[PDB]
Symmetry: C3
Subunit: 409 residues, 3 copies
Amino acid sequence: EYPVLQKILIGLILGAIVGLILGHYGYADAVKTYVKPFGDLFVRLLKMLVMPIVFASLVVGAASISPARLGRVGVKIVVYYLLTSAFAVTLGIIMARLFNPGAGIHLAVGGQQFQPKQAPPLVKILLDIVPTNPFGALANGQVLPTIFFAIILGIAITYLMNSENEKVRKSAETLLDAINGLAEAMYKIVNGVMQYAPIGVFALIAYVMAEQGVKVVGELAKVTAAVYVGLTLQILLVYFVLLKIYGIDPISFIKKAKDAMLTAFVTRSSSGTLPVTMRVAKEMGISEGIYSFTLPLGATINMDGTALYQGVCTFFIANALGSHLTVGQQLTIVLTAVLASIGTAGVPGAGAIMLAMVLESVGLPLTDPNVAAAYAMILGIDAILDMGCTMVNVTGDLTGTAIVAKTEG
Amino acid sequence: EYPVLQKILIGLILGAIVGLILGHYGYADAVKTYVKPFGDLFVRLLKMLVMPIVFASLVVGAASISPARLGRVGVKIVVYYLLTSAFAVTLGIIMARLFNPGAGIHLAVGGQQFQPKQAPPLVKILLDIVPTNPFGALANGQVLPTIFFAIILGIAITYLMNSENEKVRKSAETLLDAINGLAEAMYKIVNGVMQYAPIGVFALIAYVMAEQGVKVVGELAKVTAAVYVGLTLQILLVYFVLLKIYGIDPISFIKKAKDAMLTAFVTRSSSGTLPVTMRVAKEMGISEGIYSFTLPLGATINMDGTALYQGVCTFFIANALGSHLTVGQQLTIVLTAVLASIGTAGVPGAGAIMLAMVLESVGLPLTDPNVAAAYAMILGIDAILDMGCTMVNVTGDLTGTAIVAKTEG
Amino acid sequence: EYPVLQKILIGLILGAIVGLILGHYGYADAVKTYVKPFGDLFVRLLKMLVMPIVFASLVVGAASISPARLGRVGVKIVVYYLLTSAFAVTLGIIMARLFNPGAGIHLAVGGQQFQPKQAPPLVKILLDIVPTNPFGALANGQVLPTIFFAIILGIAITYLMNSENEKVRKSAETLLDAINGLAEAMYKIVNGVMQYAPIGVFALIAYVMAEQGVKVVGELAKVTAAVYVGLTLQILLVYFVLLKIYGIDPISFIKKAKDAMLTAFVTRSSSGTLPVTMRVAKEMGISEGIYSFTLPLGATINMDGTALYQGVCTFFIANALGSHLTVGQQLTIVLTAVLASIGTAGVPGAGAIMLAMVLESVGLPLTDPNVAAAYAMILGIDAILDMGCTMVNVTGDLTGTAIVAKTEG
Ligand SMILES: N[C@@H](CSCc1ccccc1)C(=O)O
Ligand SMILES: N[C@@H](CSCc1ccccc1)C(=O)O
Ligand SMILES: N[C@@H](CSCc1ccccc1)C(=O)O
Ligand code: NA
Ligand code: NA
Ligand code: NA
């Protein structure tokens, strides 16, 4: 059987070459059916775990840690997430100034038309974290509402345990252990699903490179390069540096987190790969009281690779119109991109409405057929970028978790 | 830190004055945002508990009590609920004959138009208590279906325990304890949410008295007086008298239930305040077998304060047209106001579709522009009335719970 | 109190004669209200159990059995289900050639019109078995997705138990027992609901006989005869013969499965009676490892009696038009009848969309006003056919579950 680490990489390199070739020879649709369904199963199976593994592991990751200690972990990780997202958009702007994406290109106007979905009022996202029905939250996604109830129950159960009454102490344990039993069961399934990863990894990027890899060449190549080299440069300058400054090996970090990074790459789903993102943190050594809180929160808020795309997409649309953004305007993109990660938060369709308000704040509405036709070209290679963006998105989740685990013991 | 009981009453009085004054100066919209956001947080936090706390505490509240003893409690609490709801509408009419709401007022017709929602066939309400999917019921509200499944599981789990097999006895106990563990954990969160109450109590009635307290003067003053003095008169005549007649202290009842009475007043939700209503019952001394059944059922059926509003609203609309109701018609309001509590039961939009069939069964349809304009004015102070009605609504819920617990031991 | 087996049979016979007579004297509607509601309660009480009993007992059925053993069970019971479904459509045709349903009958055209609902692509049925949200699946029917997560959790919990750490071993046990606690409790409730069976059985076929029993005479009689004599001839030739050949007493098999046969008959719902169909398997001796997996799957795929209806329905329609089907065509009905069982699988409205695609494949589309007018007559006795078809539908579910358990220990 062997790997694990290597067998995944075989299907990733084999799938890309069998993707690019089979798709360039006309048969892109022959890859949509037949090939992709296998990759979907892998995505589904990993999603299958995302709800129980988050809920069960955080209820025990709150009995684990002191309530004041969990509040400190939260204050640090949120500060980490905001600054790392601010660096990605700053690096995205500066990468889109090294590479010119669509500098001498006048776009054909009148293609696909887009409508920007309304951003829900900031108050009603912050309030909607507190779930009216904890069962409800669980029953249908709702990652952030489930987080709130797991911690609240986890703090209550830790209180209920060390009560003087021992008839109530047995109730508090049996519940806690069973919930840990579910958690433990999920991590055990992760490994099982991970054995299927090579086939899914093969099929997923066999589809992406076939259906979208043919369109990579051209003026769209200068976009993909400015995104990828930007993603490459952020790992080596903002992660590898922050890991070193906090006394943890960068080389040993990528080795252990390679499972949670490749799945994130091929799946393009931050929460989708969250069981693997969590299992990698447990084998890293981090205590449940930290990673069962930080990683699911980071799956929603720490969109590092996305903000790096949102910098080089704002500049792509700008150059295609022939309007170059001034010194004071480049900082105003940085502001709203970070505030878009909170202005969306729990709300579904983030990566689309998040960019809608980013393009709007600098003065480039998505409703304008001039902008909409140019943004349509970006979408023609969106899954090529999404792979890289999602990989960097969860790298920062794990990098922050490890740094908060270091500022602990 | 102190109170609890006093600190909440600080936010209540200070919120009412800062509400009435800030709203009268035009800035009712400035209270709608900023201030109210902190009131909702409190409501959502309470409602967060309502589902697990109702399910978990009723499973162990059926493990507690004998299967014939629980059905006896049922037959007693139901006969209590119907007579107190019948006393509320009888008092609502008699207060609406002492006070005259809109006796010399001809209304401006053509304002807001209303359409009454259809009341589901009685058969398909009664049958709908037996839920088809217990996880379904839990997952989305459904207080009454959850009651049925909890008692059916609680009676089975109690049968399962004292079986001759000590492999199946351990199974029954682990489940019963873990469920109790959830229940005991929820009551523990109740106390924590209760610490935030003074900020919520403040913000909720600071909003209501700002946005709706300015319109309390006028002919609408005679309605609010006939509602409130009716509510005060029902507490002192129907609750206090029934508390005395069954041998339990009236004053000490108010002292221990004031927490579940103030939250009911500011939230204006019967189920919304059910975690506090239950916690006040356990601290009172009532067995889990009774209050885990009666209080959630009372949060649905026993709408005492509401039937008292439904009494003086039927009379407000009748006076605003000039049509005075007869000696044979006043009894027909009493009938359908009570049979409206069952004709809605589980169905959402109760307090509105209930009044719809009440007004219709005396000869005043809500479709008629003449009636519709007059009801529109009543809606102008609907929250002001909702505060008082909900308070009495949960009071009757507690009062019944105590009387049945006395006819026990 | 007595029966159980007899008191059901008292209501079944009594309900038939009181139905047929009460219906033939006009008052069919008077049976629809009044009488049916009681029979619906019975159906609802059973369906109440179907979700917990399926999940909870299957997790402790995957902990019961070896992971390879279960795969073998699956591979056998699936091959069983296919060969029995194929026999029923073969027997349907062979009974529909013995009886001539609608041979000399020309239909009046222009009546009810039918549109056939689309069959979901086979890929997105198979893939939709792996549930994205386990809580979701539970929360809203989803028998098959639940089956998959229940076996995956049961294999994970069994691995987790005999792990070399005794802090993780207690976690896996407490959960497994609590889940079993739930399973056990459900089986207990099944006994309680079964005490209400005579009232339900009586009311349910009191309705069906009154509102459809009168229309059984005429050319529609020859249809009901060819179906029922078909159903009888399939039990006495493919079950009794397939039981005998596997060393299991047929007469004693019917004795023990009678309670899960007479509920299936009056409910008309395969999943509806699954709590009884499971308890009857438990009392039969069969290991939870097998029946908690084979019976829920059988309630979905193994629709023997149905495919015996689809046999004599594809012939009633063909006879009413005058077009007679050739030797090779009769086989093409058989093929797509069996394939339709997987073509629908999880999807609701199966028994309809299944038939729709069965008719289309031989050359008689349901859209055709000729066909539609003839099929509108068959529907006139569709509950009278459904009763018998549902019986043979679960009889084949147990028969298979017995044969598989015989190929074991
Ligand atoms: N599914 C992504 C969300 S953001 C990725 C992205 C990149 C480029 C364009 C659009 C969206 C994730 O889970 O990270
Ligand atoms: N929220 C209320 C429902 S009934 C109160 C009421 C008062 C005035 C007008 C309409 C309705 C409760 O939970 O009691
Ligand atoms: N309720 C059935 C579905 S198939 C029975 C049937 C017979 C004749 C016509 C249509 C349908 C069951 O669950 O077995
Ligand atoms: Na992320
Ligand atoms: Na109430
Ligand atoms: Na079946």
